[PDB]
Design a protein around this nucleic acid. Structure first.
Lengths: 80, 97, 108, 93, 97, 80, 103, 91
DNA sequence: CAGGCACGTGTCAGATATATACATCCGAT
DNA sequence: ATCGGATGTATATATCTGACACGTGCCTGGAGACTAGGGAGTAATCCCCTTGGCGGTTAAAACGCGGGGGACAGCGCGTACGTGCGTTTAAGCGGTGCTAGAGCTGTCTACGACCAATTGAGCGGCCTCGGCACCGGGATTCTCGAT
DNA sequence: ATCGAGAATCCCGGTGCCGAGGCCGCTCAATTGGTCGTAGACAGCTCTAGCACCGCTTAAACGCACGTACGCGCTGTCCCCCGCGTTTTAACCGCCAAGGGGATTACTCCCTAGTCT
């Protein structure tokens, strides 16, 4: 898998900004948002994969993601 | 032909996407991006669907909060258009830089 | 012997007392657990749940809905100030965001 | 196997504050996450509270102080009164 | 006589207090403020000297960090002077508001 | 114990801003800073007094302040 | 005889084992866990002391003060991330002035 | 009381055989050690409960080190931790 | 059983005061 | 640019001084042996849940074309904030007393751990009709080019 | 400062869907009833440090004068982002199939808690 960061299309970032309450969006916002999303995703997935590996498992369950998020103070409700 | 002035449709979209609770990022592209990112840490991983859904929801909430802080930073600078410097300032004050 | 009457009924609570006591004992919080600690904790948890559900039902009726959805929990938590501060670092699945548009963006 | 949840307990509380209001599976699993979150939050503070004073038991006094630390403002004042009311009733059967 | 240009002495004492490791706040007024605040929660309350010193260090560090964030916010708006709107923006972004 | 919030004089706030790297200061900062400092002090001292009262003590030890700060995410080194 | 010397460390394996036992962390504590934790603590202390000693020598001093510790922590990429939310008493602040304020 | 004063000073003499340490700076070193101790041990305690285990072993301390410490710092801490355990088992 | 913690003690790294050299700012020029 | 005057920084030397690092005694926390039992490693198995592929629909993304509104640069003004000087206030700093209360010991007693019956409450399986999603059309309200 | 054409939005009704809630069977974990070790509650004593007071000295705070430079309002340029129409295109739904491993139970063995020195 390569260049899947471009799967986060400009309309998706536009909709996220609209939900965040942004009226006008600059052209350079999309690339910055893709980079920030990538950094956040690596940060969460590193801990999730660590939790999965410690359990001698090969599947990343939802509880691993929940624990990884809770470690960084995000504390997601819902799943698990 | 009837053409709406630029401010109106943006605000309409704002209200529409603030009233709802759907996921705004597509699901297969996000799943492919998650798998790509997870290849670096351990090869041949089998993601459970609920884990991908939780990742998408957490990332979307984080992006919405970051865009809110970016919007306030943009308004602070006597502006309406958000710029990457606004995102950088928000992340720097929040403690992510 | 005697008729078994559950500890949650002796305290008037709805949340379990035996379950909370078992979780405290098997949670490695302390070497020993007192008798009144599960009762107090169950009462506190029941109060918090009732307080949230009151506002959640209020939000549900305000939307002409009979059932409670995560949007109603999100609205109830974010509208109340003390619940907002209690759960300020918590993301609720399928909850959305509070409608709020900045005044400068509003059209002249 | 035999999974444990607060679904029965949350539903009973719902039917007394709102007798004609239901709840969905999605919404009810969030209430299960909330209760488990607060349970670990209060018990963790009480566990540290006993260790700070070199104690070996978690009593209602430790739980009361942890509630006063974690819950803000009026939310703590009402919770303490609810907690003490149950203990007195329990102590007198 | 001679008069330094505005800002030069102001650019100084930044170079002093960023190299200095003193407290910069008078100790007895801070002690009195702590006692006045604390009497609302419990009367006839006694304080340890180390407790007041720890409170002073923590308060000063918090204020210094808030002032750095305020400076960043003020520079973001193309300004050199800091206004209370910058403090409010920094506190709002940091989650205190 | 009355009006000791004014004990935090203007030059003290200027010195703190200079350590924070601030060049110019407006007149309303000298009150905004007092307000935020008062809020922070109330928030910390409430928890410190709560710990002291739980410990069946009438003296607020430095360890109570350390615990209260560690509870708010502001861990402090040097006092225990 | 001592477990610290048997593992080639300077931090106390026995004291860490006792703190783990009284800690209430878990019902049982393994044999290698105190050794591993003592090794990790020793490594972290050694890194702090290296950076603090260098910072102290850069200031023509032969003794470590909290200012040197603060400078060492803030001037390291990863030690700053590890102790970002930590306040050091009598540590001061890192000397830094924004370029816009400079004339 | 009990502290790490003897142990921290020994580590300094190996790292800087001439540099010393003041009383207030060295108490900060003590508070740092207990802070990191509770971070790893607290995280390891959650790992046992998460996996329904009842024992804390070297596998839980190792994972807690990777979770807390950043990238390059954690890699050497694992290497130092692994080295000590192997030598301890052999001797 | 011995290492680590109270307790006591010599002593030198560091703070302070004073004189001297000097990198830097500012008004004309 | 530039050149001298004049402040505020570095630097060297004398001169104390009080924490720092080192002996010294001692006792309690760490070590070595031995024993027993339950936690966990290992084997084997079932099914379920993840992955891979294919086919058709179509809503969403990509692209192009105005064009108007917001970002940005330049100008001018006035007023609020620095910099300096004289005056006043109170913060350290040194002593004294003085007693409330943190801290350490000694009983002993109620309280929590623990084990053997006992049974009812919560969880898994399985309906079923009613709340809610969707569509189709009409009435209502907001917007924008025109007076 | 209004006015009507046009587009977006709310509402009212009708229809179908699937899951929220209720019921039934059944375990196993909560309940009772006892014993017994010990954690800490209480009484008592000690010293110590936190509080209060007084006097002196001088460093810092305060108030004022004054200049100036920077924050703010205004105006002009222009460029770039938004609205809208047309053309791909790949997400999504439905369906099928295969096998990898995630939970389970049995068996055993040896690692660690406990006690003594």
């Amino acid at each position: 898998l390569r260049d899947n960061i471009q799967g986060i299309t400009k309309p998706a970032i536009r909709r996220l900004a609209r939900r965040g309450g942004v009226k006008r969006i600059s052209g350079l916002i999309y690339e910055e948002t893709r980079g920030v999303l990538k950094v956040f995703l690596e940060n969460v997935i590193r801990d999730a994969v660590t939790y999965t590996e410690h359990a001698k498992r090969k599947t990343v369950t939802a509880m691993d993601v929940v624990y990884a998020l809770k470690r960084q103070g995000r504390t997601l409700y819902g799943f698990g | 032909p009837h053409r709406y002035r630029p401010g109106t449709v943006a605000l309409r979209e704002i209200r529409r996407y603030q009233k709802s609770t759907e996921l705004l990022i597509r699901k297969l592209p996000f799943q492919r991006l998650v798998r790509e990112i997870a290849q670096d840490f351990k090869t041949d991983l089998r993601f459970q669907s609920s884990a991908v859904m939780a990742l998408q929801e957490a990332s979307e909430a984080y992006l919405v909060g970051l865009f809110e802080d970016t919007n306030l930073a943009a308004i602070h600078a006597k502006r309406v258009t958000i710029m990457p410097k606004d995102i950088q300032l928000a992340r720097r004050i929040r403690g992510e830089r | 012997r005697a008729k078994a009457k559950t500890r949650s009924s002796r305290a008037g609570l709805q949340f379990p007392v035996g379950r909370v006591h078992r979780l405290l004992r098997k949670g490695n919080y302390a070497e020993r657990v007192g008798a009144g600690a599960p009762v107090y904790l169950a009462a506190v948890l029941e109060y918090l749940t009732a307080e949230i559900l009151e506002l959640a039902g209020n939000a549900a009726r305000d939307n002409k809905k009979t059932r409670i959805i995560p949007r109603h929990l999100q609205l109830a938590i974010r509208n109340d100030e003390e619940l907002n501060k209690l759960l300020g670092k918590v993301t609720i699945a399928q909850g959305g965001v509070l409608p709020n548009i900045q005044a400068v963006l509003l059209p002249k | 196997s035999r999974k444990e949840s607060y679904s029965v307990y949350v539903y009973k509380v719902l039917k007394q504050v709102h007798p004609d209001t239901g709840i969905s599976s999605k919404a009810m699993g969030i209430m299960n996450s909330f209760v488990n979150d607060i349970f670990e939050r209060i018990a963790g503070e009480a566990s540290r509270l006993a260790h700070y004073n070199k104690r070996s038991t978690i009593t209602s006094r430790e739980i009361q102080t942890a509630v006063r630390l974690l819950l803000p403002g009026e939310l703590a004042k009402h919770a303490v009164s609810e907690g003490t009311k149950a203990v007195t009733k329990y102590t007198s059967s």
